[PDB]
Amino acid sequence: GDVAKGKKTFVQKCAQCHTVENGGKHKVGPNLWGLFGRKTGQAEGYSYTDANKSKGIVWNNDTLMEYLENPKKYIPGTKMIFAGIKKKGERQDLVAYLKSATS
Ligand code: HEC
Numbered sequence: 001g002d003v004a005k006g007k008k009t010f011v012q013k014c015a016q017c018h019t020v021e022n023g024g025k026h027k028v029g030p031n032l033w034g035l036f037g038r039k040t041g042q043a044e045g046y047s048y049t050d051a052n053k054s055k056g057i058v059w060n061n062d063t064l065m066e067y068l069e070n071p072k073k074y075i076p077g078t079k080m081i082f083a084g085i086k087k088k089g090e091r092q093d094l095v096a097y098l099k100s101a102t103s
Pocket of ligand 1: 010013014015016017018028029030039040041042043047048049051052059068077078079080081082085
């Protein structure tokens, strides 16, 4: 993945619902600061679905790549309404940016 191309994808497809920065708001979905290594459902002050909280995974390159292909198939019942990034390369750029931007 390339970080700069992942930032482009993030602003195009994600940023209307999420922030990445430390101390950032919960815009529509939860703020993503500290994502990598965290269990699901952990951002303070956000109300998640029981589907998200019960998924039983830790967010890392591997589980993000899977989730971002098709969110509703990975977490049935999630309130994140997004069809997914189907191209692997674009997903890899995005996860490279998220890793860079959220710690
Ligand atoms: C608004 C229409 C959203 C878009 C577009 C994207 N996301 Fe999202 N996301 C949204 C909500 C409402 C939620 C909460 C889901 C729930 O069931 O409670 C989320 C959640 C995530 C998560 C999980 C966060 C964690 O468990 O703490 C991630 C990793 C995430 N979203 C990533 C993400 C990215 C990278 C997006 C662009 C490709 C994206 N989201 C778009 C709402 C919305």
